[PDB]
Symmetry: D2
Subunit: 387 residues, 4 copies
């Protein structure tokens, strides 16, 4: 059971299963994969689609003709397997030129290079059918306080995204942008470090409707934040355009563990929220098979991502359908949370004596919330111990 | 030297110096302070004014007659000292009735009660001359995943703030609201956990121009975030309405140490920012003298907040005036960061071969940023090691 | 199913279910419990025993006769229910006198008071049949760097524990001490902040055999550390004398959530280790029912602690008995880890050419560890999805 | 002013200034440095000596003939400058063969290979005059719970260190070992994650007198720990054999910033401790110049490490010499902390009614500790704001 199919909309970046195992303290432990091989193996495991950085598909500094050849072989593998490409992105972080950023580099000529590199890949994305374009500003930030004027840096970030909006609009492309936050690493502090910050920024853009977030489980957990809560805020604002699923064990380096690993309960509440809210975008796994693994472990790890999603989905659906849970939800007044506080309006509220002058504060204070019994029903469902 | 004057705009909460020393593990170590005594002593140390929660000034459940007696004695002390009251705030966290929140309590009647409690104190704040009203949603949140539907809770949060805005608009009050974020404590996770999340939420209110943020140094540091970067983003958006200054030693419980303690470098960079940007609001200290101290230590800790601000103000000014610094700032191309990427416009950028096709990537990549030299000049100035 | 009985050796402190809900930002939400009532209710839920601080059982500053009466009523409740008292401890943290510590207070007269208070409760512990005496130095540390000379503080800590060792030895008591570490809260930094630190210290005591650790799940997670790993080190040294079980969501204030909540996977690996290693001490829950709950939630929360242990035990036993897991363990060379590296000795190792001169480094490097498949079998077992 | 001299005992790893700037997300930004060039440039900035991993000096897999050519050119540069080599260490982390560890790899042959690699470099270290040999078990650990039996792994760790001690004992070498802890990265969790855990482990080795710790400022701060407190415990136990000085901004990836950056107050307190205690070992910097820098920044960052040490040394001495400070230290009873609690012995303590029965608890509790005043005097000195 728990067999993935394309109806589940699971996607993987080429850089995930293709990660060669180079870390800051050591060399690669695995050979490079041909993207064609990755397309085929993922199709067989039941994936829906693949994603790419420009540089994962076309080696940096290729001629237009070697570019043509890379894209053509990839497009044939897609046609044979039926795999789609729902999202694309730019590598503005690997090459030494980007050591101080892409869009917010201090040097003007690098910022123009970064925009040109992005625009070129936008054209390619549209040609392969991508509807979301992700931007992760992994080099945008600083190690020291004086290096970056952050107000100037935000003006340059806004500038860049406005230009990109202008481009896609002027070409008639039906693509949207999704900003991916991360708090740190590889910079000491990265600009727009959380879902909140990225949401707030988007509202100051010229055409905010074109822009959303691509939150990553591990990145918000690197700041000690509740990921389902962040996601809920992004859903509430209409801005969850895409998601990166993985695992992370607390506040440390970015681990990119397979989804389900790391904080398992947060994974459950996340799946519950995504499925209850009707999120219909890709379930995209941004993970790295650890460098201990050979290729067989690479595929077992990828298979696990999808497996763990499906198991959590089944348990969250069981939880929500259980009439004992529905009863506990009423006992905890979750239904009362969904009622407006004051649809009667301001004047009626001020005139309502039972809301102040005659409010019996001690009787309300005495009501139990019954949250611990509810949470124990959730645990029982998660663990398959509802006996 | 470094003696505060009331022109420096230093303010303190009543709850700061009046903190009796009760923590989750121990009893009070100091007697309660009469607010009249706080006002007089703060004025003597050179403070500009004081702030209050409703419940600091009028004990919860006071008759109208006691209420007036407390306000009368408070006003006289204010009159006698020339102390201002620039900000006020509501206690929606101490009483058991607020155990599941104020504005986002699952029970509707509690939510209405929280609003009426808040409104009553807005009137009092205006009477005392407050220009800013802070909200800290310390109980708004959860310890478990099922206890709060976060989309509903944000609907209720928005409803509450929209109603408060309608109130102040209809009364003709010149007062603005500032939301104070915190990521956790006393809730497992608190809603709107950081500056970014609060700035994002504001943009969805009915009258966003009336709402800004009141960031607190230690609260952002409890999520491992860079406080000056956060403040820079609030400034960029035009929403820094008030600030809470204190100290914090990394990711742990909310310490509320005196300003200058904790992350000293971040304090330097924050002062540099506030002073460079021309922030003209209060320099409010939200700190607790440690429970090891007697009253003499209370006043020493308070004096130290002001003194460290003034020391850092002088060191930041010396840093910015230093000719070697101005040369380092040019060497690191901070002036280029302040200029547009592409004020020639999108079409010219796409036509510029020097931006992409003919950009000398290896040459740009070799250019050092000279950020370490700059940062050592800043260190030298902070430490008073220049000449 | 999953019904606890005394054979499971589950114990609870009086202060756990008796926690009244006072936190740093608010008042109690529940009435005090009579310890007699707690003994009876826990007995009915299937607990083995209870633990206490001196001050949980005998109000601070009681006369010898009111002391007699408290202890007598408690001893009758124990006799009626058959509940045991396997561990006792001292409150050296609540009373204002201990604001700078007990054993490491700067003031000498407080340190002597702290030792006298502890010794008196040791006698009581022995009389009620306790075999472990826990010390948690919650006030031992500092908020500022100059306040405490830490070498002096360690000399005073050693002094105190040596005196206590001398006492129990001279009385012929068969009780052992267990040091409980915590990294911070309510002090900025607490002395002996982790399991490691406490282990290292114990080796410098006059009679190290009398002393062990009482590690708490949430406390090691407050420093971002792996709790099963810490426990394994404590087991390896022969020093795991007792354990505090609960849950915690990462690096923040001490949450004391019910066991199973917080990091669920770490809970599974913990149970696996305790049951595999044959740990035979109490399974003691140090948790606080959240302040949202009434008394019914208090008992549901306590019941959950034991339930979640039993469910995890069943899944870890299933995991270990699965011949497919046993195969995966061999594939990952866990059996090879248990073989000595060089039982042939130093000279034989230096003379072994296949270990260096002829070691084929590239062939060894190419071996996969197969850890991801093993971990996925663990996840499957935990979630009850081995289909 | 603040010019280092070789008498200040400042040392640097070859890998520090030679770090090429390759991080997990980007390519090298600087060319490799010839170790001869590092030695000469460091000597010019006033360094005392250098340290090396085997693989820094002799590339992995070098013939014996290349090995000798590299050592010969290195020795000549050492001779020419007067530079010492006080410490050496083994790279058991970069090559794929060490992907599951060196001493604790699940495969036995890898463990034997790690030992032989280490032994070969101990000989070379002794030849160059090293008195300390550091071990950093960067690969010793796990990403998942089942992958490592931690009791077995510690048996293997002990075996490895015991063998190294037998080696040095049998050769007659005057060299000591120092274990360098780190909590995580590049492993999910690393074994012996903190100073405490390493100190504890040492006591279980066959010849513990030969083993001490090499703590690193940023590594302890990655667990949110107080570095000066950790150093104080190592000193107390007589085990501070070497130290790594650098900077770190809280709980995240290992930043290895220049010393003085990061937590500046903790740096002040650390210098105060080292200088007060008379630590006579090397002041070793384990830092990486950020990848934004060119070679001129490399040397600036290195010079800055030394300079910040010397500035803080002067400020700590001024603090300790200040008469107002000595008075504050008496007011806070630091002198009483240095004296015994009960040098009258256990029987006298139990007989002393002033210690318990007749102790005036309310009077002792009212005494302020005066820690804030003390700490503001320390702030004033660090900032150079005293007179
Ligand atoms: O979208 C860009 C992607 O770029 C990189 O691979 C980042 O590490 C990953 O977090 C992100 O999702
Ligand atoms: O403004 C409201 C204030 O309420 C409480 O005292 C908080 O702990 C504090 O951080 C906040 O600034
Ligand atoms: O043993 C003493 C006990 O004291 C307190 O209740 C602590 O909060 C708890 O962590 C500890 O287990
Ligand atoms: O001594 C061994 C050294 O090895 C590596 O370079 C580590 O990253 C470092 O922290 C350590 O000090
Ligand atoms: O409890 C009083 C009840 O009345 C309401 O305020 C409105 O129906 C409920 O939300 C609350 O739970
Ligand atoms: O010292 C002040 C700080 O100390 C604590 O009591 C310890 O938990 C906090 O609640 C408070 O903010
Ligand atoms: O793999 C070579 C094998 O030979 C051993 O070193 C000894 O049996 C094993 O531990 C290793 O896995
Ligand atoms: O700037 C130096 C630091 O930068 C990083 O590359 C970013 O991940 C770390 O690996 C390194 O220690
Ligand atoms: Mn299906
Ligand atoms: Mn699919
Ligand atoms: Mn940048
Ligand atoms: Mn990631
Ligand atoms: Mn990602
Ligand atoms: Mn009164
Ligand atoms: Mn007057
Ligand atoms: Mn928004
Ligand atoms: Mn605070
Ligand atoms: Mn505040
Ligand atoms: Mn049973
Ligand atoms: Mn039991
Ligand atoms: Mn102490
Ligand atoms: Mn705890
Ligand atoms: Mn405990
Ligand atoms: Mn060579
Ligand atoms: Mn010579
Ligand atoms: Mn030990
Ligand atoms: Mn490091
Ligand atoms: Mn190091």
């Amino acid at each position: 059971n728990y067999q993935p199919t394309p109806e589940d909309r699971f996607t993987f970046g080429l850089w995930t299963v293709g990660w060669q195992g180079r870390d800051p303290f050591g060399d690669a432990t695995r050979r490079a994969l041909d993207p064609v091989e990755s397309v085929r193996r993922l199709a067989e495991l039941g994936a829906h689609g693949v994603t790419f950085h420009d540089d994962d598909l076309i080696p940096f500094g290729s001629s237009d003709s070697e570019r043509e050849e890379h894209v053509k072989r990839f497009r044939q593998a897609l046609d044979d397997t039926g795999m789609k490409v729902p999202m694309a992105t730019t590598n503005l972080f690997t090459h030494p030129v980007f050591k101080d950023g892409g869009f917010t580099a201090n040097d003007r000529d690098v910022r123009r290079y970064a925009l040109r590199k992005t625009i070129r890949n936008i054209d390619l994305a549209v040609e392969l059918g991508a509807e979301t374009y992700v931007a992760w500003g992994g080099r945008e930030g600083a190690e020291s306080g004086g290096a970056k004027d952050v107000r100037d840096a935000l003006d340059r970030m806004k500038e860049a995204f406005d230009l990109l909006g202008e481009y896609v609009t002027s070409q008639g492309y039906d693509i949207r942008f999704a900003i991916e936050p991360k708090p740190n690493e590889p910079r000491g502090d990265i600009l727009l470090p959380t879902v909140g910050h990225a949401l707030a920024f988007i509202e100051r853009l010229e055409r905010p409707e074109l822009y959303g977030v691509n939150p990553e489980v591990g990145h918000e957990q690197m700041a000690g934040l509740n990921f389902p809560h962040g996601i809920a805020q992004a859903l509430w604002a209409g801005k969850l355009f895409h998601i990166d699923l993985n695992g992370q064990n607390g506040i440390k380096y970015d681990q990119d563990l397979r989804f389900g690993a790391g904080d398992l309960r947060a994974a459950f509440w996340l799946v519950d929220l995504l499925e209850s809210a009707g999120y219909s975008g890709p379930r995209h796994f941004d993970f790295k098979p650890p460098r201990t693994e050979d290729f067989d472990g690479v595929w077992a790890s990828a298979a696990g991502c999808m497996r763990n999603y499906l198991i959590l989905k089944e348990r969250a659906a069981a939880f929500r359908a259980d009439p004992e849970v529905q009863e506990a939800l009423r006992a905890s007044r979750l239904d009362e949370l969904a009622r407006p506080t004051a649809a009667d309006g301001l004047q009626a509220l001020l005139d309502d004596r039972s809301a102040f002058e005659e409010f019996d504060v001690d009787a309300a204070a005495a009501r139990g919330m019954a949250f611990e019994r509810l949470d124990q029903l959730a645990m029982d469902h998660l663990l398959g111990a509802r006996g």
